């Protein structure tokens, strides 16, 4: 009950009992909170409540110290001091932004802006509070009791009346009952059980709510610049494949942390693995939020690094399949590949944090808390997709508010920019270069003459709120008959429900833009589906079209994004 004040450090006994995290506030700061917010409960060893029997006055502004004990105006003895005077609340050892963070519901963009423009200790407060609020929100949805099982990938669900029915995408992971995590896709619903088990009739699912631990470490450790490469030993024989990245690899060694902005297909994983071959003694921990991000860094490591010094760390609560070709759960290997959530407490010469646009400030903190490293390298692209903010429903979260790393990349610029896309036909590179990279992204590849756009608004139907455009799928079906090379194309849309319909009618493999991020396919068919803020998001659009190595067909709903596409237009 005796801690440091989460604004100005000053020691105190005073926590806010009305904040859901119960931060230590100093007397000067605890006042400025309780006199400007609905927050009136102050905690110490014993709470600031009237000590008089059967009295329910808990508001610190209405209370006094009568000797050793606390009382209201109705109960205080004659010789009694008010708890709230001279800009202080009586405690031992005797903020606008803090107030907004403490009282916001996290449904407004402006909440996330503030949680990223504030001081560093407030960003940790912001991050615990948000994650806490995100988790206490999960409780608010209804249970799904199984009515009838049909097959091994279809069942019928009965939903708890009174409480809302949560969105049934790959984003919302359920816990069955204890029969391992489960997911759902659209009364013909598809059940994807992480642990295989013949789905019991009467068994029920609930959204996994995990206790939010406190944050000690900053999002970003303070920035150190060195005159010499510190604690790392470069090779002089450095394989020509990685010669582009030498001057950036020497930057990495002459700073505490470095930011790398790599637009799609610019050699981010090449750089991350190229760092181990340049500092070949250095112990490196490769981390990202998702199993797919970590498994891609593993694929690159298998090609260029010795397999006996590589370990893939897997949490005992195995939620998906992931990389098998390394030794599993050897914490002590030179090369450690691990999702942020499963990190051990370790030291490292270098930590590489990949897919940084998907990182929350919570994630940035946990990494500084689990990994103690000479150098931190932050790899991703603020022009790509952020982690979904399930509470945010009002306003759009701009890239500079994604996390502290993206804020740095969008303000002072990144330390290192991979400026040549080697994946995408020039038509795609030229479009996204103008759209999100201020014309600084260059095409290696020639124009493919296999990049098509069609403006076709079609008809928008909705499965709950997820959008479908059958006519846009119909246009694709027509195109495929005349373009058999596209038979092998991945179908991409901003909506699962669209993808579900496109699966049945086209037979193509299916990916949402968000789940496509980090992957590449020869041919891509993209139906925008709707003209919403979701489907017009320039970051989502950027990712959607940069998945393609050879060709893309974009059926567009939005005039602006249609006109910007530097593609041959089709008719019909
Ligand atoms: C062509 C072979 C050697 N691999 C290779 N060289 C790269 C250089 C920069 C970015 C990505 C790269 N991938
Ligand atoms: C330095 C001593 C006290 N042990 C220690 N504490 C750690 C915390 C995070 C990562 C690695 C750590 N190793
Ligand atoms: Zn409070
Ligand atoms: Zn203080
Ligand atoms: Zn009283």
Among the listed residues 169, 186, 179, 188, the one whose alpha carbon sits nearest the alpha carbon of residue 206: 179
User: Closest Cα to atom 13, ligand 2: which residue?
Assistant: 346
Q: Tokens 């103008």 label which residue?
A: 434
Length of the chain in residues, anyone? 572
Which residues, including other chains, have CB under 8 Å from residue 504's CB and lie 6 or more apart? none
Which residues, including other chains, have CB under 8 Å from residue 109's CB and lie 6 or more apart? 392, 394, 395, 396, 397, 398, 401
Annotated binding site: 5, 8, 16, 19, 26, 29, 33, 39, 50, 55, 72, 75, 262-269
Burial 440-461 (b: 16+ CB within 10 A, else e): ebbbebebbebbbbbbbbbebe
DSSP 30: H
Q: Are 508 and 535 in contact (CB under 8 A)?
A: no
Among the listed residues 551, 563, 572, 558, the one whose alpha carbon sits nearest the alpha carbon of residue 527: 558
Interval between CA 210 and ligand 1 midpoint (Å): 41
Question: Ligand 1 pocket, 244 CB below 6 A?
Answer: yes
Compute how many other C-beta atoms are within 10 angstroms of the C-beta atom of residue 162: 5
Paired strand residues for 9: 5
Among the listed residues 225, 222, 253, the one whose alpha carbon sits nearest the alpha carbon of residue 404: 222
Among the listed residues 435, 414, 415, the one whose alpha carbon sits nearest the alpha carbon of residue 540: 435
The CA distance from 527 to 529, in Å, is: 5
The CA distance from 5 to 26, in Å, is: 5
Q: Tokens 């496109």 label which residue?
A: 502
The CA distance from 137 to 134, in Å, is: 5
The CA distance from 215 to 366, in Å, is: 7
User: Closest Cα to atom 6, ligand 1: which residue?
Assistant: 241
Side-chain half-sphere exposure of 238, counting CA atoms within 13 A:
20
Side-chain half-sphere exposure of 407, counting CA atoms within 13 A:
20
Q: Tokens 């020497």 label which residue?
A: 250
**553: enclosing H helix or E strand:** strand 548-556
In sign, the C-alpha dihedral spanning 14, 17, 23, 26 is negative
The CA distance from 383 to 163, in Å, is: 37
**The two structure tokens encoding residue 506:** 């086209």
Which residues, including other chains, have CB under 8 Å from residue 56's CB and lie 6 or more apart? 50
User: Closest Cα to atom 10, ligand 1: which residue?
Assistant: 267
Ligand nearest to the CA of 22: 3
The CA distance from 571 to 135, in Å, is: 48
State the first-to-last Cα distance of the chain, in angstroms, to the nearest integer.
70
Interval between CA 14 and ligand 4 midpoint (Å): 10
SS3 of 496-550: HHHHHHHHHHHCCCEEEHHHHCCCCEEEEEEECCCCCHHHHCHHHHHHHHCCEEE
- Listing DSSP states for 335-369 in one string gives EEEEEGGG--SEEEEEEEE--GGG--HHHHHHHHH
Q: Are 94 and 88 in contact (CB under 8 A)?
A: yes
The β-bridge relationship of strands 310-312 and 335-339 is parallel
Interval between CA 501 and ligand 1 midpoint (Å): 38
**The two structure tokens encoding residue 181:** 């995590």
Question: Ligand 1 pocket, 243 CB below 6 A?
Answer: no
How would you class 17 by CB atoms within 10 Å of its CB: exposed for 0-12, middle for 13-18, buried for 19 or more? middle
Which residues, including other chains, have CB under 8 Å from residue 363's CB and lie 6 or more apart? 289, 340, 387, 403
Compute how many other C-beta atoms are within 10 angstroms of the C-beta atom of residue 514: 20
What are the CA-CA distances from residue 134 to residues 15, 129, 210, 354, 419 (Å)? 22, 8, 10, 24, 37
The CA distance from 356 to 323, in Å, is: 20
The β-bridge relationship of strands 284-288 and 335-339 is parallel
SS3 321: coil
The β-bridge relationship of strands 490-493 and 466-468 is unpaired
The β-bridge relationship of strands 9-12 and 3-5 is antiparallel
This structure was determined by X-ray
277: left (phi over 0), alpha (psi -120 to 50) or beta: alpha
Mutual orientation of helices 538-545 and 426-436 as an angle, nearest 10°? 160
Ligand 1 pocket mutation pick from 238, 248, 249, 267 by most atoms within 8 angstroms of CB: 267
Side-chain half-sphere exposure of 145, counting CA atoms within 13 A:
6
Which residues, including other chains, have CB under 8 Å from residue 135's CB and lie 6 or more apart? 209, 210, 211, 212
Among the listed residues 496, 453, 495, 444, the one whose alpha carbon sits nearest the alpha carbon of residue 476: 453
The CA distance from 468 to 558, in Å, is: 15
Pocket of ligand 2 (CB under 6 A): 345-347, 370, 372
The CA distance from 493 to 547, in Å, is: 12
Which residues, including other chains, have CB under 8 Å from residue 415's CB and lie 6 or more apart? 248, 251, 255, 258, 259, 260
Q: Which atom of ligand 2 is nearest to the CA of 372?
A: 10
Strands of 381-427 (E only): list them: 416-417, 420-421
Q: Are 457 and 423 in contact (CB under 8 A)?
A: no
How would you class 285 by CB atoms within 10 Å of its CB: exposed for 0-12, middle for 13-18, buried for 19 or more? buried
Among the listed residues 125, 130, 159, the one whose alpha carbon sits nearest the alpha carbon of residue 142: 159
The β-bridge relationship of strands 310-312 and 327-328 is parallel
The CA distance from 533 to 404, in Å, is: 24
The CA distance from 38 to 530, in Å, is: 41
Resolution (A): 2.2
**288: enclosing H helix or E strand:** strand 284-288
* 426-564 has CATH 3.30.565.10 classification: no
**The two structure tokens encoding residue 74:** 């109705």
The CA distance from 378 to 251, in Å, is: 13
The CA distance from 168 to 189, in Å, is: 9
The CA distance from 194 to 175, in Å, is: 10
Mutual orientation of helices 120-138 and 109-117 as an angle, nearest 10°? 150
Q: Tokens 């659209």 label which residue?
A: 186
Interval between CA 373 and ligand 2 midpoint (Å): 10
φ/ψ of residue 182, rounded to 5? -145, 150
Side-chain half-sphere exposure of 436, counting CA atoms within 13 A:
27
Mutual orientation of helices 268-278 and 246-253 as an angle, nearest 10°? 70
Question: Ligand 1 pocket, 267 CB below 6 A?
Answer: yes
Strands of 113-188 (E only): list them: 144-149, 155-159, 174-176, 181-185
Q: Are 510 and 476 in contact (CB under 8 A)?
A: no
The CA distance from 416 to 419, in Å, is: 9
The CA distance from 198 to 176, in Å, is: 12
What are the CA-CA distances from residue 468 to residues 452, 473, 530 (Å)? 21, 9, 8
Ligand nearest to the CA of 15: 3
């Amino acid at each position: 009950a005796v801690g440091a004040c989460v604004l100005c450090n000053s020691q105190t006994s005073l926590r806010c009992g009305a904040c859901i995290r119960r931060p230590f506030l100093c007397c000067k700061c605890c006042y400025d909170h309780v006199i400007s917010t609905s927050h009136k409960l102050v905690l110490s060893v014993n709470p600031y409540v009237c000590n008089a029997p059967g009295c329910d006055v808990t508001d610190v502004t209405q209370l006094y110290l009568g000797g050793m004990s606390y009382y209201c105006k109705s109960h205080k003895p004659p010789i009694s001091f008010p708890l709230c005077a001279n800009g202080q609340v009586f405690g031992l050892y005797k903020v606008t932004d803090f107030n907004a963070i403490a009282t916001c519901d996290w449904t407004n963009a402006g909440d996330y802006i503030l949680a990223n423009t504030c001081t560093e200790r407030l960003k940790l407060f912001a991050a615990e509070t948000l994650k806490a609020t995100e988790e206490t929100f999960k409780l608010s949805y209804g249970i799904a009791t199984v009515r009838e099982v049909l097959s091994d990938r279809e069942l019928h669900l009965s939903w708890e009346v009174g409480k809302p029915r949560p969105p049934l995408n790959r984003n919302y992971v359920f816990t069955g009952y204890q029969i391992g995590e489960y997911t759902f896709e659209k009364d013909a619903v598809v059940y994807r059980g992480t642990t295989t088990y013949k789905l019991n009739v009467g068994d029920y699912f609930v959204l996994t709510s995990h206790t939010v631990m406190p944050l000690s470490a900053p999002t970003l450790v303070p920035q150190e610049h060195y005159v010499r490469i510190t604690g790392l030993y470069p090779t002089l024989n450095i394989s020509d494949e990685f010669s582009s990245n030498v001057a950036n690899y020497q930057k990495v060694g002459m700073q505490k942390y470095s930011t790398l902005q790599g637009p799609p297909g610019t050699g981010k994983s090449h750089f991350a693995i190229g760092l181990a071959l340049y500092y070949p003694s250095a112990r490196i921990v490769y981390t990202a939020c998702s199993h797919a991000a970590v498994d891609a860094l593993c694929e690159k490591a298998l090609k260029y690094l010795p397999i006996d010094k590589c370990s893939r760390i897997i949490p005992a609560r195995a939620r998906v399949e992931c990389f098998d070709k390394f030794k599993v759960n050897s914490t002590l290997e030179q090369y450690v590949f691990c999702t942020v959530n499963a990190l051990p407490e370790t030291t490292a010469d270098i930590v590489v944090f990949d897919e940084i646009s998907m990182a929350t400030n919570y994630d940035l903190s946990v990494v500084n808390a689990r990994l103690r490293a000479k150098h931190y390298v932050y790899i991703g692209d603020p022009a790509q997709l952020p982690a979904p903010r399930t509470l945010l429903t009002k306003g759009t979260l701009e890239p500079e508010y994604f996390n502290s790393v993206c804020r740095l990349m969008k303000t002072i610029g990144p330390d290192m920019f991979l400026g040549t896309c080697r994946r995408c036909p020039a038509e795609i590179v030229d479009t996204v270069s103008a759209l999100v990279y201020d014309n600084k992204l260059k095409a290696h590849k020639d124009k493919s003459a296999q990049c098509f756009k069609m403006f076709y608004k079609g008809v928008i139907t909705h499965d709950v709120s997820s959008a479908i455009n059958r006519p846009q799928i119909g246009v694709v079906r027509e195109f495929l008959t005349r373009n058999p090379a596209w038979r092998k194309a991945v179908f991409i849309s901003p909506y699962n429900s669209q993808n579900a319909v496109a699966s049945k009618i086209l037979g193509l493999p299916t990916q949402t833009v968000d789940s496509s991020q980090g992957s590449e396919y020869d041919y891509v068919i993209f139906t925008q589906t709707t003209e919403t803020a979701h489907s017009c998001n320039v970051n989502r659009f950027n990712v959607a079209i940069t998945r393609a190595k050879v060709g893309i067909l974009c059926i567009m709903s939005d005039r602006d994004l249609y006109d910007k596409l530097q593609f041959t237009s089709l008719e019909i």
